[PDB]
């Protein structure tokens, strides 16, 4: 899932801000 | 924003620095 991908990698700035609500 | 893998406290700090005071939800950790 996205949490797994953001964890086990250098999470990109946009992948990170995609979480923002 | 910083670099490195974010798994751990770094993710919360990342979300705080990028989304701000709104954007994610953290339960009271105790």
From Swiss-Prot, chain B:
Q: What is the effect of changing residue 10 to D?
A: In HPRI; Providence
What name does this protein carry?
Answer: Insulin B chain
Source organism per entry reads: Homo sapiens
Q: Its encoding gene is what?
A: INS
Full-protein interval shown: 25 to 54 of 110
């Amino acid at each position: 899932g996205i949490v797994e991908q953001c964890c086990t990698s250098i999470c990109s700035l946009y992948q990170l801000e995609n979480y923002c609500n | 924003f910083v670099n490195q893998h974010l798994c751990g406290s770094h993710l919360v700090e990342a979300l705080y620095l990028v989304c701000g005071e709104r954007g994610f939800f953290v339960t009271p950790a105790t």
